[PDB]
Each structure stands twice: as C-alpha cells, then as structure tokens.
Scaffold this motif. Structure first.
Motif, PDB file in Angstrom:
ATOM      1  N   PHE A  35      -2.301   2.235  10.759  1.00 40.07           N
ATOM      2  CA  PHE A  35      -2.109   2.296   9.325  1.00 40.07           C
ATOM      3  C   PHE A  35      -3.461   2.199   8.613  1.00 40.07           C
ATOM      4  CE2 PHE A  35      -0.391   0.745   5.125  1.00 40.07           C
ATOM      5  CZ  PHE A  35       0.313   1.901   4.815  1.00 40.07           C
ATOM      6  N   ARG A  59      -2.089  -1.706  15.956  1.00 44.95           N
ATOM      7  CA  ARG A  59      -1.290  -2.846  15.519  1.00 44.95           C
ATOM      8  C   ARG A  59       0.041  -2.823  16.269  1.00 44.95           C
ATOM      9  NH1 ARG A  59       1.285  -1.097   9.519  1.00 44.95           N
ATOM     10  NH2 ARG A  59       2.416   0.668  10.454  1.00 44.95           N
ATOM     11  N   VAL A 101       5.185   3.978   9.247  1.00 39.70           N
ATOM     12  CA  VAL A 101       6.642   3.976   9.507  1.00 39.70           C
ATOM     13  C   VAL A 101       7.251   5.271   8.960  1.00 39.70           C
ATOM     14  CG1 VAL A 101       8.807   2.757   9.094  1.00 39.70           C
ATOM     15  CG2 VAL A 101       6.728   1.475   9.606  1.00 39.70           C
ATOM     16  N   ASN A 119       9.676  -3.225   8.333  1.00 40.38           N
ATOM     17  CA  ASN A 119       8.455  -3.422   9.108  1.00 40.38           C
ATOM     18  C   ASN A 119       8.340  -4.941   9.320  1.00 40.38           C
ATOM     19  OD1 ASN A 119       5.944  -3.442  10.393  1.00 40.38           O
ATOM     20  ND2 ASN A 119       4.949  -2.035   8.989  1.00 40.38           N
ATOM     21  N   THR A 175       2.769  -1.578   1.100  1.00 43.53           N
ATOM     22  CA  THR A 175       3.744  -2.609   0.739  1.00 43.53           C
ATOM     23  C   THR A 175       3.066  -3.977   0.671  1.00 43.53           C
ATOM     24  OG1 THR A 175       4.454  -3.097   3.003  1.00 43.53           O
ATOM     25  CG2 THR A 175       5.507  -1.259   1.943  1.00 43.53           C
ATOM     26  N   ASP A 176       2.023  -4.194   1.469  1.00 42.76           N
ATOM     27  CA  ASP A 176       1.244  -5.417   1.306  1.00 42.76           C
ATOM     28  C   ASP A 176       0.712  -5.552  -0.110  1.00 42.76           C
ATOM     29  OD1 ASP A 176       0.084  -7.748   2.903  1.00 42.76           O
ATOM     30  OD2 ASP A 176      -1.602  -7.035   1.710  1.00 42.76           O
TER      31      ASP A 176
END
Ligand SMILES: NC(=O)NC1=NC(=O)NC1=O
Ligand SMILES: NC(=O)NC1=NC(=O)NC1=O
Ligand SMILES: NC(=O)NC1=NC(=O)NC1=O
Ligand SMILES: NC(=O)NC1=NC(=O)NC1=O
Lengths: 295, 295, 295, 295
Positions: free
Chosen positions: A159, A176, A227, A254, D57-58
């Motif tokens: 990512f 990751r 994702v 996630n 999203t973080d």
C-alpha cells in the motif's frame, strides 16, 4: 398518518434435516437458520386492529418446518424459492415473501482416512447464505453469498501511492500483512418462477464453489496493490465464469496488524525487515466495498 | 481487614509472530491471546498505596512482546513456561506467575493441491489452550486443553434406564441425535523447572494431537449409552497413551435437537423412525463433567 | 483409570415468574437464568453405563420450574438454597447440589412520574448473582455477587510510584481516566441448613444494596492511587457493615483510554492538561483482583 | 466488467471526548463509535491500481479525531453533518460521505442524592444513533434512531382474530406477556447544508427525547391488539409532534414467553389464569416492521 411500508414474519427459526440412505446406511445432515418476512394487503392490522389479514408468525414457523419435511432443503436457493412461492400462492392478500437463510457447516468426519456415515464436525464458522425475494408478478430474485471466511497473508501485500495531505500520517509500505473476513454476494438474473429456478439447480452449488475458489486463489496469489484492486480481480473472474450472474459485491474489512517498536529495549530490532512480532488490532478497521457488474 | 489473596496483571494481550524460512521462502504464522497474572509480596499496594511493589501491567504487556521476540512461541506449553519463569526470577518479591494462552488457528491454505507459502485460513474457531502456573520453589504446573470443537452425530446415541419418579417426563430412547462442544483438559505431572519442560517439548504437540484424535474417533464410533459413558471412554484412552498426564477432565454440553410432531397437519409423520426435521434448541442444555485420574 | 470427580446437570435454564397483587393490581416480575449441577454416588454412569443412578437433566429442568411455582424466587440466595436442598434430601445417592443463578433486571417503569403497575424496562445489563453449594452434612455455602456494573471517572485517578526497570515505558501520571466493569463477590458464613438461611432472609437484599452503594460511592469519591488501593477501600467497608460476611472479593479490569497526540497536525494540543479527545482501547486491559477477609 | 458502486472508509472508530467546566468543576463525557464511508471518482483504485485517488482510511480515522477536537460532538446529528461535509468540501473527487455514529450512555452518577461532577455509569446498553448521508449538490439526509431499548409488560397484551387455516396451531389469547427490543428511526426532511442543520440543533435532542417518551408511554398504556397496532400508535404520535420528520420506522421483535403446563405433576395449575412461571424463549422470534409517513 399513512403506512408507507410494512413487513412482518418470523426470525431465527433454526432447522435441522437429516437424509438417510437405507442402501448405504450413510446419513447426511443440514442445519440452517431461517427468516421469513411477508408483505401484502396488511395495513389494517396496523391501523384498524384488524388481525384477520394476519397470517400468525407462529403459523409461518409451522410452515417452515412442514415445507422442509416435504421438500429438499438443498441447495438453499431452491428451498428458499419454494418457501417464498408458497406464501404468495397460498394467501391471496400476500404479494411478497422475503426469505433469508443461513446454512451452517456440518462437514462429514473422516476417521482413519474413511468418511464416517453419521458423524459431523463444524469445521468452520463460515456460512453460505441466500436472500430470496418472491414477488407476485415479478418473479424470484436471488442473492447468494458466503460470509465469515477469515484469511491472512503474511507478505505480498502493499500500500503506497495514496493521497498525502495534512491529515495523513500513514507511511507507504511495500510489504505488510493483509487479513480480512470475506463477505461476497452474487446476484442472479431474475427468474420467472419455480420452474425456472428448478431448471438451474446444479448451477447453484457449482457457483458457490467457484466464488469460494476464486476468492481463495486470488487472495493468495495476488501481489496486492490494495484491498480495492484485489477484490476487483475476484469479482471480475466470477462474472466471467457464470453468465446467469448480473452482479458481484464484496465487503472486506482490513484487520490491521501493527508493527511493534522494541528498539527502546536493548536496541531490539522488530520493525521493517526485522519485523517478527506484531500486535493484532481489534479496532478500528478499514472497510472496503465494491459492486461489479457487466459492461 | 486483611488481604487474603491477590493477583494482578494484563489480560487480552493479542500477539502475532511470523517465522520466515529464507531457504524455502515458506512463512509460518502464530497468533495467540495472552493473560498473565502475578502474585507476591504486593499487599501494600492494596493497603498502603504503595506502588513501589507494582510491576506495572503496562510493563507486563511489554514483557510479553519482548519474550515472544526472543523465544519460540510454540508449543504454547513451552512459551508459557518461559514467560512465567521470567517474572519470578526477575522480580524478587514476585513468587507466582499465572499464564493463560489461547492459540488461534491459522491453517496453511492449499491452492491447486499445493500448500501456499504465506497464505492462511482460520479453518475453525476451535482453540488450543494452556494454563501455566509458575510458583517459586514448587515448579511449573501445566494444564493443556482443546475447546470449541463442535460435533454432531445423527444416530448411534441412546439414553434409557435413567431414574424415573414424579419429576420425570423424558421418554427413553434408543436412537437420538447427540451434539456437543468439546472442552477437554489434560494436566501434566509437575515439572521441576524450565529444563525439565524443555526436555519434554515433543510430547506437547503429540499429546494435543492424540487427545484430539481419540476424542473424535470415540465420539464417532461409540454407540453411546449416555454422555457420561462416552466421555469416560475418551479420558481413559488418553491416560493410557501418555504417562506424563496425571488427569484428564472433560466438560461436555448436551445440545438438544427436539423432534417435531407434524401429525396435526395432514397426518404428516415426523416422529420416531419417521423423524426427519428437528428443532435445534438454543437453551437449556445438559452439562456433564468428569475428571479421570490414575488408579 | 478412576473417576476422581464428577458433576452433571442442566445449564441455561431461563425462568420468568410473575407475582400479581389482586388488591392493588400491581404486578411484579422476576427473570433469572439457572444452572444446577449435582454430585453423588454416580460414578457407575460413567464407568459401567449404569443410567439408574442418573436423575435425568431433563428432570432437573422440570424440578426448577416446579420449585419456582411453589416457592418464592426472591431473594435468589433463598431460592437457590431451597432448590439445592431439594436434590440432596430427595435423592439418597445425591450428596451435593451446586446452584448458580443470574438475576436479570426488570425495573418498573415510571410513566408521568407514576410507577406503572405491569410495565418494566431492562434498565441495565448489570446482574445480581448467587452461587449456592448444598452439601450433605456440611450445610449451605453461599457466594453473592454483582457483575456487569460499568463505570467511568474522568479525573481523580492517579498512577505514579510504580517499579521502573528496562521493561518499563509507562509514564507516571497524576490525572487519568479510570474505567472498569465491577465484579464483586461477598461470601457468607456457612449456614447449617434452610432454617438458618430463612432466618437471615432480610440481610440478603440489604447487603446486596450496601455492596452496590459502597462500590459506587468509593469509586466516585476516592482520589485513587491505583485500582489496587481503591478496591481495598470498598472491600473493607462492606466487611465492616455486614458481620455474616467472611470475605469480599473484587475483580476489576482497567479499561484504558489513551491520549491522542495531534501536535503533528497544525500544532494541535491534545495531551496532558489539553487532553480532550481520547481513544478508548478495546484490548489489552489491566486485570486486578483482591480477596479481603477478617483480621 | 465495470464498477457499478463503490465505497470505502473506516469502521469501529471509538471516540471519547470530555468537556470540563473551569467555573463549576463539572465534567461531562461523550463516547461514540464512528463509521465513515466515502464515495467518489475512485473506481481506478479498483480497476487500475491507482491509489492516488485514495484518501487512506488511516487518514479518515485521523480526521475523525481532529474534527472531534475542534467541534462539538453533540448532538450526534450535528457532529455527523460536520464530519461528512468536511470530506466532500475537502476532496474534489469525493462526492458523498456516509457517517454512522453510535452514542454510548455515560450517565452522571448521583451519590447521596447529589450528582457527581466527574463520575459516570453505563446505566443501560440502549444506544442513540445517527446515519448522516452528505451528498455533493443534494444536501444532508439524516436518520436518527434509538436501539436496544428492552421492555416487557406482564399483562394487557392480546392476540386474537388472526387468520386460521391448516397451518395454524396458535391459540387465541386475551392476556399475554409482551416483550421487545425497540428499534425506532425518524428520518428528517432533507437539509440544504450545514447552516440549515445548525439552525435546527435544539430539535435533535428534543425529538430523541419525545420519540423515547412516546415509545415508553404507548407501550405501557396500550391494551395492545397486536405488535402491529401498538407500534402504529407510537409512530403516529411522533409524526404529530415534530413536523421536520418525514417518516418514522419501527422494527420490533416479539420475544416470546411460553406458559408451562405442570398439571402432569400433582395436578399443579400453571396455565391460563393460574399461569405464574413461564419459559422465556431465546428463538425463534416474531419480527414486525412498519414505516409510517405523512398523509
Ligand atoms: N406478533 C403478534 O402480535 N402476535 C404474534 N405472536 C405469535 O405467536 N404470532 C403472531 O403473529
Ligand atoms: N492498574 C492501575 O492502577 N495502573 C495500571 N495502568 C497501567 O497501565 N499499568 C498499571 O499497572
Ligand atoms: N445427557 C445425556 O446423556 N442424556 C440426557 N439428555 C436428557 O434430556 N437428560 C439427560 O440426562
Ligand atoms: N485498505 C488498504 O488497502 N490500505 C489501507 N490501510 C490503511 O491503513 N489505509 C488504507 O486505506
């Protein structure tokens, strides 16, 4: 005021059925949980205290057991269609039936390499589900799904390249952990009625199987960019392999596994390429959804 | 008043560890949930507000991660012994450590008949557990267990010959469904310390495996007279196959599946030998426990 | 092999009872969940398939309902004593009964400032529990408890002065959030039998009330030095106010609320005295236990 | 294939905020769980592995905390509108934000009849919720709800006059227990944007309060003809008392309490007018839904 919409029925109806082969002595079991909600000309039960229009939810429950006694309960797409069709044919004032079924796993045990004739194990909490909507004069709409399939890959997830502004603290990464609980739904083309559903019966189990296989192999083999990217790949394949599917939808959390910096302790190295111990995070979680259809 | 007993620590510590084989490229993952509770000369933290005797539970959490970084985390019986021994050796005033570990399943996926090098599936909610009590001057006591193993057999269970009095309504039967969630614990002979535990390391996984196998095969093959009788058979075998076990304990619910009488509807026959559709009961449930030891 | 210990019975027996006052028209409801486990001369059901010694768990369930029909179900300490005494008096070979009861809240609604005669609300998930052990020739042992009482204070909690070594990263603080789920148990002196329990009936509700009040007021008023210190204060008071209590035990998680550093964003100040937004942590949690008895 | 629909974000974001009155010393706390899902021109993250269009999203999580730091978090209808508006104004390619908030109860404790300045209790598991949809060029749509409100009345519920056919076994009754878990949603008229939402801020808490009160009083006072009839009465009143509400929806399970026939035991009378002990049923349950709008 006015009733704009109304439905009522019975939820959490647990059902077991056993099939016994005289010949072989082999037994096969089915367990499901059933929800049936009805719609129709029933507004006066709400507005006028007219219970005459109400098919008691207790009777709905009875009907579920009787139908299971007299029909196959597998594949769930067939059983749901039979159950919903019953309500709308049987009652003149009931024009839609909504049937949800959760199919629970009872996998035959293998003892000494031999499959046992009557012993089973709940080998996972993964479910096979159906939602069947039976609507007078508009056929039968079926959504099939798998849920509760929990997976993890320990590498070959990336990512990087995401938007960076003053709200961003996340570091780009090229390696990751990726873990999720798969929720995948495939929506069938509308069926005109029970005959049509019965003509396609072999496709239901085959397609469930295909959706499962593709999901598993794509997750394992994709060097995932995100994702989003990986789930698009799964949806595309399923659509390619079953033409009676109009759409595929995926909903994937996630479930984050965070590195733990241990350098404060004796210079211990546990980050980046030395990362060995991680803290699984219970919350919050990313949530990524896609509905893919035909071009 | 007086402190009669006291323990404190950290619960619900989730841990992931990955092992990576350079050579093969194969990765292996471990995930557990850890509880560590300490006992010692700590009463004054309760009575005098003396925090000097307190090893912060935050530090306990840190210690769990560091220990996992520096030691094997498998078998859980070894890792728990190493963790508890640390606390009592490290702190002069801490004389007992209680470590509970839940081991979560991450089973390697097979894709195209080939095991994948870094993708896993939670193939069931069954757990492997350990309880390790490390006590200064009294060694290391280990209880190993499996839990959450859910099974069903559709015939070859009986229950007749029980006490009948004015509180009894249950009918004798010679053919019923038997379903349970297995909780089985095997208690090891006391170990003198870490060296002794390390000398027996291969026995831990082997015995877990044996307890599982025996449990499964006995449930499937026993024409069960009752839950009591069947579980005694399992416990006896395990004790026969591992001499370092002092006791075996089983805790088995009886999850009832009730027949449904449908004769009120068109004379439909769904009881006794015609029983095909059953109602699984969520509650209440029978609960049967046994601790079996050596004669 | 040999049976070292054995108990069996029925779990998760849900019971509702209503009391109706003819005179006033006021109704009062009780709902509980009951577990009853029996011990006795029952080893041959395990070893010999002898079901003659078994009081069917189905009959145990029946007995629970019948007993509730014929006796008061409140206070739970009385009802449990009556139920367990029944089993050991009734069956010659049954020598111990273990009764666990969970009492569920049904609080009378107040409508327009007036208490309603027959409508109730589950005003919280807090429970009142009893564990009653009835043992032939050794009387009746009762442990009473409250559980599921969830509280938070936003200041007037401290934690400084704890042990600091190379495993420690936690900073001392003089102002933090403290939140917990209270589990408190008070153990009564042994009772010789039912007459003695009946003579003390008013003390059971009064003591539950006192334990609750003390718990609440001490948590709110104590400028807490730690969880240890505060819970010792609660236990001491309860023992001081009820002489028939031999011990008090508390089990208190520390449910952490972490500060969030927002200084990376526009120098936003959200730590220490500027701390306003916090992240509640689902896991891990501190766990602190104490058993306090008489000096 | 083609992306037909897509949304992504962060779920299960737990947030605590404290408000501290210098003047009075009184503290007030807020705890919620937040879900934010975004829609926009993001299809290429799915199809092309283009992460440039992705707001991580973080970062969404970060934004939630920062927004809570800089704005009121109450009423949740306001905070959700502020949060969703942020995303669509901030990012040119993001055109819809979906915000779900669950508000958790932290009720001020009263100690000695006095409200405490900084101690709270989770007095129930009932929630206050909002769903806020913020859509570029189409304003702000808000659905407010209460959920988890569990109630029971022990009499003044009836169910007779329903359809009777060959699937029916349920007996008519003129006196039964009625218990449910209330889920009630009120949908506001569309708002043009934040100014409009801010102008109506006092109405949000007032209407939540009214919906609660009406729900409670109607359940308690209605001599209910059925769940249908009673819930229609609640919906009608709420609509009558708040003109900015377009629809009210209720979803009510019927949690059955069954009579228990004990006549087999010593002629014990526990049915009909002698009914005192009942068996609460965990499943199945009736499920009744209504959406009521304006005529
Ligand atoms: N839901 C109701 O108001 N009455 C119901 N209880 C039942 O058992 N059947 C119904 O339809
Ligand atoms: N439990 C307490 O009172 N303080 C605790 N919080 C921590 O983080 N470590 C402790 O020991
Ligand atoms: N647990 C058993 O083996 N049989 C049992 N089922 C029942 O209903 N009563 C028992 O005791
Ligand atoms: N969901 C993903 O593929 N990457 C994500 N992880 C994060 O922390 N932010 C994302 O958007």
């Amino acid at each position: 005021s006015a009733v704009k919409a109304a439905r009522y029925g019975k939820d959490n109806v647990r059902v077991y059925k056993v099939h016994k082969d005289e010949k072989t002595g082999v037994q096969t079991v089915y367990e499901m949980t059933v929800c049936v909600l009805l719609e129709g000309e029933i507004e006066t039960s709400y507005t006028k205290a007219d219970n005459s229009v109400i098919v008691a939810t207790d009777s709905i429950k009875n009907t579920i057991y009787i139908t299971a006694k007299q029909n196959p309960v597998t594949p769930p797409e067939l059983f749901g269609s039979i159950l919903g069709t019953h309500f709308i044919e049987k009652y003149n004032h009931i024009h839609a039936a909504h049937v949800n079924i959760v199919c629970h796993r009872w996998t035959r045990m293998d003892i000494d390499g031999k499959p046992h004739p009557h012993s089973f194990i709940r080998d996972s909490e993964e479910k096979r589900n159906v939602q069947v909507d039976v609507v007078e004069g508009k056929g039968i709409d079926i959504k099939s799904s798998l849920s509760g399939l929990t997976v993890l890959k320990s590498t070959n997830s990336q990512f990087w390249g995401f938007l960076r502004d003053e709200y961003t603290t996340l570091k780009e990464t090229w390696d990751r952990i990726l873990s999720t609980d798969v929720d995948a739904t495939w929506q069938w083309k509308n069926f005109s009625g029970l005959q049509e559903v019965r003509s396609h019966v072999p496709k239901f189990d085959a397609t469930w199987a295909t959706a499962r296989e593709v999901t598993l192999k794509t997750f394992a083999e994709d060097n995932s960019a995100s994702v989003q990217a990986t789930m698009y790949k799964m949806a595309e394949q399923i659509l390619a392999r079953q033409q009676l599917i109009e759409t595929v939808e995926y909903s994937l959390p996630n479930k984050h596994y965070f590195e733990i910096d241990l350098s404060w302790h004796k210079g211990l190295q546990n980050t980046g390429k030395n990362a060995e111990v991680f803290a699984p995070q219970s919350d919050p979680n990313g949530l990524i959804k896609c509905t893919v259809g035909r071009s």
